[PDB]
Amino acid sequence: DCGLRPLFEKKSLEDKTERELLESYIIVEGSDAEIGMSPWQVMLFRKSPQELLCGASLISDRWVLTAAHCLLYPPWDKNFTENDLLVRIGKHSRTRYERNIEKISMLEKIYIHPRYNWRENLDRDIALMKLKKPVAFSDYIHPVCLPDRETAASLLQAGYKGRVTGWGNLKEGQPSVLQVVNLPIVERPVCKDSTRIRITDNMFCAGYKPDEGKRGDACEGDSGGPFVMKSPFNNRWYQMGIVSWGEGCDRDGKYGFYTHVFRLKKWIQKVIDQFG
């Protein structure tokens, strides 16, 4: 039942910008999200001090997907464990305890990809989190779909637009509510030529060219969040990427880099069936 939103697809109602995504299938400079627009959006919350760590996504009633560098990053002495964090699902407001709406969960086990490369370019920047107990779905909480080989092949193309959501910085003040922005996928060559960092096949970049007029990007605080696309075949939302890294925020000639979810799906399946 993944990827079908209670307040939209199931009622045959469209959100205000999804048409832009479908029309292309031939957070800085984002807008406030509509209620229930991204029911799979998760907030990684640190207990002490109470603070926003990263974004993440709900892929089932028991698992949450996020970026490995949100939990483990030796250069900044970051190394969190199960009890250092809380997962908050179904939110809209960044700072308020949305009573009766959001659900806060504890973590049972964190899984970081064995070959996550924090030393050089954040290659394989992905991690799974097993919640202590299943989250009940609702109008504001619903999992997103993971792509199958076919869906990934036909949607992950230069020019095609995806959607990124997060409570991160609005500029390189934080927002009051979840922000959203739609960005086009950029050709590998252009991605490579925009940075000194060695780019691997487990990443793709997104953003507008300096001449396209439109702009927008993810920023600090958004890492670990989902880059989603709506399939025009079955109308479901699929998570194609994970906000990984960027050089600054919304700089011209620069683009955001995302973890290529499908390329690492084997590991995801492996961990899920072997541990629950």
């Binding site: 919350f45 207990k47 109470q50 603070e51 926003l52 809380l86 700072t95 308020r96 305890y97 806060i104």
Partner: peptide
């Protein structure tokens, strides 16, 4: 500026 979450979760 985060709002106090219930101690039941902490």
């Amino acid at each position: 500026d985060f709002e106090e979450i219930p101690e039941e979760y902490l």
